[PDB]
Design a protein around this ligand. Structure first.
Ligand SMILES: [Ca+2]
Ligand SMILES: [Ca+2]
Lengths: 213, 213
């Protein structure tokens, strides 16, 4: 029951922070938890950097070719997830994940049949702009509004089916949770640290390093 | 026309970053722009720290007693705003404001009669929780969704009237923009840097220092 397989769609992740790549910081955070028995990393075909990393020969790491879209790479990862009952999907560019948040997320397998994700409550006042221009239409109630983060933890086959159906029906998919939502599910929100950022822009690297060390 | 009076409701701001208090970093960012001819700082009665700051004897700074609510302190500030046609309201705890953002915000007085605010576009996927629990109701479209920041720049008397009416009618007020919104106005959104954070929690101080220096 407690066995978990992680999937990291990695098809910025190769930038480094302390002689270790962001991807490695990311993957090592997952492998720190005892329940994570395997990590499947989906990389783009032609990606010649991964093979030169220590992760390439790790006994608990399996590499597979990813796809064009995020959901595509996650589905590819799920195919090498063995018989794992629960899957943990985590961003390749989120190296600041903390063990306490991860542990609280994994607890969901004992109290939920849908799974859930790490999220941070909205602090700032939010505004909805008017369609087509930079004018404020109205203020969006921030109460009950959350920033979706990762990992996202769900039963393996359910995640597979939801993302498979969402794609077939051409649904607008953002994160893994949105695939469950599209199929009528309502994943749990597990509060996590706001410093769990995704390195996407140049400045993000320096900030990630600040958070990490 | 171009004369602007700033109001800072300061009734964390006294924590320091480099031998200078957050309030000072904040106020000095406003005074850096030539158009800001005056800064009215509203402090709580009994606040004995302000008087011991250099801001207390600055020729362009006026101090007044603030109130119980934010809108209350801003209204008090507006009373000492002289005949300024446009007012710039800025958080006492936002020391990372940059001159380029400020300058672009002030340009609104030449192209708008309602004013506007500094804001950062939402990046993360947002989730709306179900009423009463930590379960995801659905994903909130982040397109056209913005993080409201400060300064907030509006015609002086209009701001006064909108906040005066909003309060009298017991409306739910968050920022100054929300007061204009309540009265049927739609302030402009001027994109600003996301590093313009408000120091509210212990960790925010270290982060602010990182952004500043
Ligand atoms: Ca391990
Ligand atoms: Ca000046």
């Amino acid at each position: 029951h407690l066995d978990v397989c992680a999937v990291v769609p990695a098809a910025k992740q190769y930038l480094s922070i302390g002689n270790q790549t962001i991807l490695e910081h990311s993957v090592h955070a997952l492998l720190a938890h005892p329940r994570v028995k395997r990590v499947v990393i989906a990389i783009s075909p032609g990606d010649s950097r991964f093979a030169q990393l220590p992760l390439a020969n790790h006994p608990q790491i399996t590499v597979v070719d990813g796809g064009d879209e995020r959901a595509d790479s996650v589905l590819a990862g799920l195919k090498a997830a063995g018989d794992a009952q629960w899957v943990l999907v985590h961003d390749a560019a989120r190296p600041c994940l903390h063990q306490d948040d991860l542990a609280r997320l994994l607890a969901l397998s004992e109290t939920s049949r849908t799974g859930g994700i790490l999220a941070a409550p909205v602090r700032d006042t939010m505004k909805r702009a008017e369609p087509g221009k930079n004018a404020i239409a109205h203020t969006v109630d921030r109460n009950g509004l959350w920033h979706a983060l990762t990992p996202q933890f769900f039963p393996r086959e359910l995640l597979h089916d939801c993302l498979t159906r969402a794609l077939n029906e051409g649904a607008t998919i953002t994160d893994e949770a949105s695939a469950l939502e599209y199929c009528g599910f309502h994943p749990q929100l597990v509060e996590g640290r706001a410093d769990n950022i995704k390195v996407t822009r140049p400045e993000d690297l320096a900030l990630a390093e600040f958070y990490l060390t």
